[PDB]
Every structure is written in C-alpha cells, then in structure tokens.
Design a protein around this ligand. Structure first.
Ligand SMILES: CCCC[C@@H](CN[C@@H](CCCC)C(=O)N[C@@H](CCC(N)=O)C(=O)N[C@@H](CCCNC(N)=[NH2+])C(N)=O)NC(=O)[C@@H](NC(=O)[C@@H](NC(C)=O)[C@@H](C)O)[C@@H](C)CC
Lengths: 99, 99
C-alpha cells in the first residue's frame, strides 16, 4: 500500500498473541515499543531521540507482522512515547520513500 | 525519487542562504532545525520525543526546498542533534511510504 503523510503513519502490528498500533518511522534506526513482556533473554542498552538518552532492553530475533508483512529481528522496549517501527524492520518489508 | 532505508534518509534542503543535510522523518509531526540565526518574529515552544523535551523557537512561513521541491511552512530552531524534516513539509512535496 501507499501511505500519505497528512495523518500519522499508524499501523496495527501483531507481536504474537497481541495486536498493537506502531508508527512507521524512517527517522528511527531501530524499533522501540512501550514497556511490555516478551518471550526472550535480554540485554540493557541505551538509545537517543531529541530530548536525550534512555535505558531500554534489547530482544534479539522477534517475529513481528507489520500490516500482514513478516519481519524477524531486534525489538527494543522501554519508555518511548509512541511505539515506533524503525529502519531495521522496514527494510525487511521493503519500505521506501517516494516523492 | 525513491529513497531506500538501508541507511538514514539524508537529503539537502535550502532555508535562508544555506544548503543543509536533513533527515526525512515520518515520525516527526514538525520540522526542526539546529540553532540558526533567522530574521523574523518567533514564538517559543517545547517539543519532545525519546529522552524529554527541548526548548525551541517557532518561525512561521519559512520557504524551503527539499531536494528541488519548494515548500513553505513553520520550522522550529533549537538544539537538535540533527536537522529533521517532519510531515508538515513532506506532505507539501508529495511524499508517500510504499510497501
Ligand atoms: C535526533 C532525533 C532524530 C529523529 C528521531 C525521529 N523520532 C521521532 C519519533 C516519534 C515520537 C517518539 C521524534 O522525536 N518525533 C518528534 C520530533 C521532533 C518534533 N517534536 O517535531 C515528534 O513528532 N514528537 C511528537 C511527540 C511524541 C509523539 N508523537 C507524534 N506526535 N508523532 C510531537 N509532535 O512533538 N529518531 C528517533 O527519535 C530514533 N532515534 C534514533 O534513531 C537514534 N538512534 C540511536 C541508535 O539511538 C540516533 C539519531 O541517535 C529512535 C531509533 C530511537 C531508538
């Protein structure tokens, strides 16, 4: 599908068992989700945005389905204001910007 | 064009007499430039994201050119680690996400 930017580029994703709402974001290297439990082993990491640094926890190899598209890779969970889908998963689904 | 997301999508824009590199960000509601001396009245404000809020200056009706496509709109100036082009302006040059 083609998505226009007059509205927030918001999509439903399954994070297995559950359904969430995430923001397709070109401006994010990685994927970060609101604090939730996942089936995995994790390691503490730090990421940045406009206001500074935050501690998150990394989960390697989690299958995510973005609008019915399949992706398998890293997922960071911590105190992010909006769930966001980064370039790490977008490239798996073959997302590009057109103008 | 068609920009792939293997790397951060960085483009050259013109604001004032300057050519600058900015990140195309579908997860930014607004456009935010790093500290720069523009003429004009501004109103102050706060924007946040990962990490917290930073204080910035709001300038209205500032004409740009995002890689040879003109736009006009509000731009925020403050201490961002990077120049960011939000949707306010991407909506003007006809950019979509496609997968
Ligand atoms: C230097 C900043 C670079 C741009 C920025 C775009 N992020 C959006 C994300 C979506 C909301 C969290 C952002 O801050 N958006 C603001 C930006 C500036 C602005 N405020 O216009 C925005 O829309 N904020 C909303 C408030 C949050 C709600 N969301 C929303 N309305 N869309 C708003 N209107 O003010 N990227 C990020 O915030 C991401 N950070 C990175 O990609 C950083 N990478 C690492 C490895 O840490 C790198 C640059 O150091 C992700 C990967 C963190 C792991």
């Amino acid at each position: 599908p083609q998505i226009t930017l007059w509205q927030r580029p918001l999509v439903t994703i399954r994070i297995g068992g559950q359904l969430k709402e995430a923001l397709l974001d070109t401006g994010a290297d990685d994927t970060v989700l609101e604090e939730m439990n996942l089936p995995g082993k994790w390691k503490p990491k730090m990421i940045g945005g406009i206001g500074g640094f935050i501690k998150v926890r990394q989960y390697d190899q989690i299958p995510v389905e973005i609008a019915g598209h399949k992706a398998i890779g890293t997922v960071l969970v911590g105190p992010t204001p909006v769930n966001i889908i980064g370039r790490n998963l977008l490239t798996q689904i073959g997302a590009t910007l057109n103008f």
